[PDB]
Amino acid sequence: GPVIRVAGDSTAVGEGGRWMKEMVEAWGKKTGTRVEYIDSPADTNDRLALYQQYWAARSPDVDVYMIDVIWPGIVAPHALDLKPYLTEAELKEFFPRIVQNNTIRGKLTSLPFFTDAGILYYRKDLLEKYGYTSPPRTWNELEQMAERVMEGERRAGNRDFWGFVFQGKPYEGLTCDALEWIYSHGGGRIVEPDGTISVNNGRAALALNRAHGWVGRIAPQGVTSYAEEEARNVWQQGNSLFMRNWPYAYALGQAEGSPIRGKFGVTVLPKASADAPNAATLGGAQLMVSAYSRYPKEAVDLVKYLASYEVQKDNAVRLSRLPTRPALYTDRDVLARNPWFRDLLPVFQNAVSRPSDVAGARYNQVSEAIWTEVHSVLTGRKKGEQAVRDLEARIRRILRHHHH
Numbered sequence: 001g002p003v004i005r006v007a008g009d010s011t012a013v014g015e016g017g018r019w020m021k022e023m024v025e026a027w028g029k030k031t032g033t034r035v036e037y038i039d040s041p042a043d044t045n046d047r048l049a050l051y052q053q054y055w056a057a058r059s060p061d062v063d064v065y066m067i068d069v070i071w072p073g074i075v076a077p078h079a080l081d082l083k084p085y086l087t088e089a090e091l092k093e094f095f096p097r098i099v100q101n102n103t104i105r106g107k108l109t110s111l112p113f114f115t116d117a118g119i120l121y122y123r124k125d126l127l128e129k130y131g132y133t134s135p136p137r138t139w140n141e142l143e144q145m146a147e148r149v150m151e152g153e154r155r156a157g158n159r160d161f162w163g164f165v166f167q168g169k170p171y172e173g174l175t176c177d178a179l180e181w182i183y184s185h186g187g188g189r190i191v192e193p194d195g196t197i198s199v200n201n202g203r204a205a206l207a208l209n210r211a212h213g214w215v216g217r218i219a220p221q222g223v224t225s226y227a228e229e230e231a232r233n234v235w236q237q238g239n240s241l242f243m244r245n246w247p248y249a250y251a252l253g254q255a256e257g258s259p260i261r262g263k264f265g266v267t268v269l270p271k272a273s274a275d276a277p278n279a280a281t282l283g284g285a286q287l288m289v290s291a292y293s294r295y296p297k298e299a300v301d302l303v304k305y306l307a308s309y310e311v312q313k314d315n316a317v318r319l320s321r322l323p324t325r326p327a328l329y330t331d332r333d334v335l336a337r338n339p340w341f342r343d344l345l346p347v348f349q350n351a352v353s354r355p356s357d358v359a360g361a362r363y364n365q366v367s368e369a370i371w372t373e374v375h376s377v378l379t380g381r382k383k384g385e386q387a388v389r390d391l392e393a394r395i396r397r398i399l400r401h402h403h404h
């Protein structure tokens with residue numbers, strides 16, 4: 001019979017690729033359907049380029065793709081409309097904001113799979129050791145705590161110890177980190193939902209100068225090459241006070257054999273001042289049936305399975321990844337394993353989106369401009385004032401003649 005082939009997630013990031021292959025194989029066994037899993041590179045912008053080769057070719061060689069939350073506007077032509085396959089009641093079991101995000105010109109491009117938000121990981125043992133009772137609420141507090149704890153841990157002989165790690169590589173992850181910096185300084189959304197390109201302002205410029213000031217000081221010089229996993233590995237070895245990352249890192253840091261098991265918590269990222277908005281960049285993954293799949297019925301069935309309550313529960317319990325079904329946030333087993341799912345729910349609900357709705361199919365070009373200009377601040381090439389001006393100009397060229 002048919003072989004249903006899935007491209008989604010990556011074995012290069014934590015357990016997500018291994019787990020996804022396990023889920024697809026479970027579906028195959030349950031239904032008596034042959035399946036194959038095609039692996040992907042770690043970074044989402046690299047995954048997009050890979051998948052675009054198949055789409056450009058109208059290739060039937062992948063039936064189901066795991067797509068980023070920023071992609072529906074780009075990928076819609078390549079997606080089978082799922083709307084006729086789901087009842088209104090089935091669709092209402094997901095968060096309506098995510099179903100909306102996935103709907104482009106009426107086409108339900110994909111089912112919500114897991115959501116995501118940037119959060120602050122912190123070493124509770126170290127905060128206690130150095131006389132701190134709570135994680136930092138402001139970026140200045142974060143800098144002060146990092147400097148003090150670094151001074152102490154270095155003096156004690158840990159030459160590998162840093163204050164803060166994050167994603168500073170030039171790729172989509174840096175657009176996420178930078179939106180959080182900019183938005184948490186009251187600098188706006190880079191491109192506002194209405195289309196206004198707002199980034200050329202002093203709050204945005206200050207946010208980027210602040211981030212530059214961390215590099216080689218409280219963060220490694222090499223942070224300008226870090227994606228999720230490079231940051232995670234410094235952190236998980238016990239060598240960073242703080243880390244910005246996504247929910248997946250939590251289960252991995254709690255695993256048996258992790259040096260930091262039981263030594264950390266999570267909270268909302270800091271902000272410039274008490275009246276700035278909290279920033280958590282919205283992330284996550286959706287499940288798309290290929291427009292070019294020869295087996296739409298079977299592929300839909302697989303996507304419904306992967307998006308089901310029990311599969312999302314397993315993702316939550318074993319991989320600490322955020323459900324797209326509100327009902328799971330009240331499930332006793334999800335909450336006993338990840339109590340912070342409840343504590344941080346309002347942070348996840350108020351997550352700030354990158355400008356993928358307003359940029360639509362041009363989002364990847366906009367993001368590349370963002371991460372390249374931001375990276376130029378991190379590397380010391382430009383100051384934040386020049387970078388936000390240059391970024392404004394670049395995005396204006398990209399979006400000229402584009403309307404949402």
Ligand SMILES: OC[C@H]1O[C@H](O[C@H]2[C@H](O)[C@@H](O)[C@@H](O)O[C@@H]2CO)[C@H](O)[C@@H](O)[C@@H]1O
Nearest residue numbers: 013016042044116172173246248283284
């Ligand atoms: O790098 C930006 C990218 O980060 C997040 O995706 C992670 C996800 O959290 C991990 O579980 C795993 O799948 O790797 C991805 C990073 O490569 C966001 O979900 C995503 O929206 C964002 O673009």
